[PDB]
Amino acid sequence: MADKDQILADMADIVNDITGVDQSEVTFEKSFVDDLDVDSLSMVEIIYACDEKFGVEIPDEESKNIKIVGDAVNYIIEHQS
């Protein structure tokens, strides 16, 4: 049971696992791309980890929407429970 805050703890891991961005560095206000250095591959890999780790399949529509933690994480918690 991971809440949106937990999505950042869990995402902190994935993020630190793919981009290596810090658990501390994954706040609710960091742009994935600009602040969490998330390139298309970073988000693609994250989307993969997210789809498996959280059961959250981010379609191209979501992946492009997911540019900041607020969108990414809110989406992850959207399907998380």
Range of the domain at 71: 4-79
The C-alpha atoms of residue 36 and residue 26 are separated, in whole angstroms, by 7
> Residue 60's CB: how many other CB atoms inside 10 A?
8
**Is 39 in the active site?**
yes
In Å, what is the CA distance from 67 to each residue of 1, 36, 38, 39, 60? 24, 10, 8, 10, 12
Contact call for residues 36 and 15 (beta carbons, < 8 A): yes
Residue 8: CATH number of its domain: 1.10.1200.10
CA 18 to each of CA 1, 52, 61: distance values in angstroms, whole numbers, following the listed order: 23, 14, 21
| Among 39, 51, 60, 71, the one annotated catalytic | 39
Using CB atoms within 10 Å of the CB of residue 67, give its burial: 0 to 12 exposed, 13 to 18 middle, 19+ buried. middle
Domain count for the chain = 1
How was it solved?
Answer: NMR
Strand partners, 31: 68
